[PDB]
Scaffold this active site. Structure first.
Site, PDB file in Angstrom:
ATOM      1  N   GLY A 114       0.210  -1.429   0.103  1.00  0.00           N
ATOM      2  CA  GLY A 114      -0.048  -0.145  -0.139  1.00  0.00           C
ATOM      3  C   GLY A 114       1.336   0.989  -0.036  1.00  0.00           C
ATOM      4  O   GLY A 114       0.274   2.141   0.725  1.00  0.00           O
ATOM      5  N   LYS A 116      -0.861   0.505   9.802  1.00  0.00           N
ATOM      6  CA  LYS A 116      -1.686   0.859   9.651  1.00  0.00           C
ATOM      7  C   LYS A 116      -2.935   0.248  10.839  1.00  0.00           C
ATOM      8  O   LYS A 116      -3.624  -0.643  10.840  1.00  0.00           O
ATOM      9  CB  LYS A 116      -2.704   1.369   8.775  1.00  0.00           C
ATOM     10  CG  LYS A 116      -3.558   2.469   8.730  1.00  0.00           C
ATOM     11  CD  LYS A 116      -4.174   1.869   6.927  1.00  0.00           C
ATOM     12  CE  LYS A 116      -4.704   3.472   7.178  1.00  0.00           C
ATOM     13  NZ  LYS A 116      -3.644   4.673   6.224  1.00  0.00           N
ATOM     14  N   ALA A 154      -7.615   9.337  14.302  1.00  0.00           N
ATOM     15  CA  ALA A 154      -7.315   8.637  16.192  1.00  0.00           C
ATOM     16  C   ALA A 154      -6.583   8.058  15.045  1.00  0.00           C
ATOM     17  O   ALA A 154      -6.731   6.192  15.887  1.00  0.00           O
ATOM     18  CB  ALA A 154      -8.734   7.472  16.160  1.00  0.00           C
TER      19      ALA A 154
HETATM   20  N1  LIG Z   1      -3.779  -5.331  -1.242  1.00  0.00           N
HETATM   21  C1  LIG Z   1      -4.164  -4.296  -1.286  1.00  0.00           C
HETATM   22  N2  LIG Z   1      -2.746  -4.466  -1.869  1.00  0.00           N
HETATM   23  C2  LIG Z   1      -1.730  -3.178  -2.626  1.00  0.00           C
HETATM   24  N3  LIG Z   1      -2.277  -1.722  -2.567  1.00  0.00           N
HETATM   25  C3  LIG Z   1      -3.728  -1.888  -1.761  1.00  0.00           C
HETATM   26  C4  LIG Z   1      -4.144  -3.353  -1.052  1.00  0.00           C
HETATM   27  N4  LIG Z   1      -5.419  -2.594  -0.724  1.00  0.00           N
HETATM   28  C5  LIG Z   1      -5.217  -1.514  -1.060  1.00  0.00           C
HETATM   29  N5  LIG Z   1      -3.953  -0.437  -0.996  1.00  0.00           N
HETATM   30  C6  LIG Z   1      -3.951   0.059  -1.282  1.00  0.00           C
HETATM   31  O1  LIG Z   1      -3.445   0.803  -0.162  1.00  0.00           O
HETATM   32  C7  LIG Z   1      -3.503   2.662  -0.498  1.00  0.00           C
HETATM   33  C8  LIG Z   1      -3.999   3.221   0.583  1.00  0.00           C
HETATM   34  S1  LIG Z   1      -3.170   5.115   0.386  1.00  0.00           S
HETATM   35  C9  LIG Z   1      -1.799   4.704   0.470  1.00  0.00           C
HETATM   36  C10 LIG Z   1      -0.781   6.260   0.740  1.00  0.00           C
HETATM   37  C11 LIG Z   1       1.018   6.033   0.685  1.00  0.00           C
HETATM   38  N6  LIG Z   1       1.556   4.878   1.831  1.00  0.00           N
HETATM   39  C12 LIG Z   1       1.592   6.597   0.142  1.00  0.00           C
HETATM   40  O2  LIG Z   1       2.971   6.394   0.828  1.00  0.00           O
HETATM   41  O3  LIG Z   1       1.415   7.839   0.454  1.00  0.00           O
HETATM   42  C13 LIG Z   1      -3.829   3.015  -1.934  1.00  0.00           C
HETATM   43  O4  LIG Z   1      -2.952   3.505  -2.884  1.00  0.00           O
HETATM   44  C14 LIG Z   1      -4.502   1.467  -2.214  1.00  0.00           C
HETATM   45  O5  LIG Z   1      -4.026   1.479  -3.582  1.00  0.00           O
END
Ligand SMILES: Nc1ncnc2c1ncn2[C@@H]1O[C@H](CSCC[C@H](N)C(=O)O)[C@@H](O)[C@H]1O
Length: 284
Positions: A62, A164, A195
């Site tokens: 992510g 997270k 939160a």
């Molecule tokens: N199963 C999965 N595998 C990979 N990425 C995932 C996912 N479920 C959600 N995500 C990712 O989770 C992210 C949430 S926001 C992530 C922000 C990132 N850490 C930054 O540095 O900006 C999204 O980009 C979404 O594509």
């Protein structure tokens, strides 16, 4: 703002020593990337101290767009720490992460099956896990996110992890769920009334803990007090150009970081670090 005199900020959720009834009533450019970069610099620098970072592969699920990750990678690269980065996300990453031989960019949504394939390819190298996955989100979305994060740990078996962690709100409860044991690290420069925290685990084998609806209420009240009262104080005794709590909090995080350059004072080191971070993120 209200003035206050503190010896240290609250680093972990447990330290919050008061609560306030949430009130529905609800700034910096690129504050999200700053928030992530700090917590990840903190978590990774704490692994550097324990000597478990060198020789590790960081698996960031992510990570997109992940602009701040380029500052992480450069920081440890310039420190001589040998690290491999693997950033996996369904969305595309910030192109600033292009052309780095030690950074592998993977465009894919991870599931259980794929988690096994990357484990087999990385084993038996040390894996450090960083997850920021999110699918506003519902309690069902969070529960699925947290279930996937658990699968991340059980399959990838990382030496340490940053997950997270934002408890579902008590008025949106559904069922009890389980999360790993870890330290609930508080995030400076998070959204005004967020939160959300980071669950930092160093695994000696993991143990799960149940989260109840009474826990959701504890989180809501403690986080509100933190966001309403604490984060709105000016730390009048703090020796820094900006005395607002979030900078007080950031300061304590930053002093755990390692630097190649030598400075005459801890304050000069934090000041140099903070400016470097802000300049890269385009924050005045
Ligand atoms: N199963 C999965 N595998 C990979 N990425 C995932 C996912 N479920 C959600 N995500 C990712 O989770 C992210 C949430 S926001 C992530 C922000 C990132 N850490 C930054 O540095 O900006 C999204 O980009 C979404 O594509």
């Amino acid at each position: 703002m209200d003035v206050v005199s503190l010896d240290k900020p609250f680093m972990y959720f447990e330290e919050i020593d008061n609560e306030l009834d949430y009130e529905p009533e609800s700034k910096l450019p690129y504050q999200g990337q700053l928030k992530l970069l700090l917590g990840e610099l903190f978590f990774l620098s704490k692994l550097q101290r324990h000597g478990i970072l060198d020789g590790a592969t960081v698996v960031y699920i992510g990570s997109a767009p992940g602009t701040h990750i380029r500052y992480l990678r450069d920081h440890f690269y310039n420190l001589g720490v040998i690290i491999k980065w693997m950033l996996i996300d369904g969305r595309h990453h910030d192109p600033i992460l292009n052309g780095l031989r030690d950074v592998t960019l993977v465009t894919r949504f991870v599931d259980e099956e794929y988690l096994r394939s990357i484990k087999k390819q990385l084993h038996p190298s040390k894996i450090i896990l960083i997850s920021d996955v999110r699918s506003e989100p519902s309690t069902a979305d969070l529960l699925s996110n947290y279930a996937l994060q658990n699968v991340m740990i059980s399959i990838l078996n990382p030496v340490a992890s940053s997950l997270k962690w934002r408890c579902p709100f008590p008025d949106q409860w559904i069922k009890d769920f389980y999360i790993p044991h870890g330290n609930k690290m508080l995030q400076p420069f998070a959204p005004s009334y967020s939160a959300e925290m980071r669950l930092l685990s160093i695994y000696t084998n993991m143990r799960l803990t149940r989260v109840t609806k009474s826990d959701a209420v504890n989180y809501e009240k403690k986080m509100y007090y933190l966001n309403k009262i604490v984060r709105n104080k000016v730390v009048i005794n703090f020796d820094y150009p900006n005395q607002e709590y979030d900078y007080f909090h950031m300061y304590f995080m930053l002093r755990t970081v390692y630097c190649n350059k030598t400075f005459p004072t801890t304050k000069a080191k934090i000041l140099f670090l903070q400016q470097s971070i802000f300049r890269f993120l385009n924050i005045p």
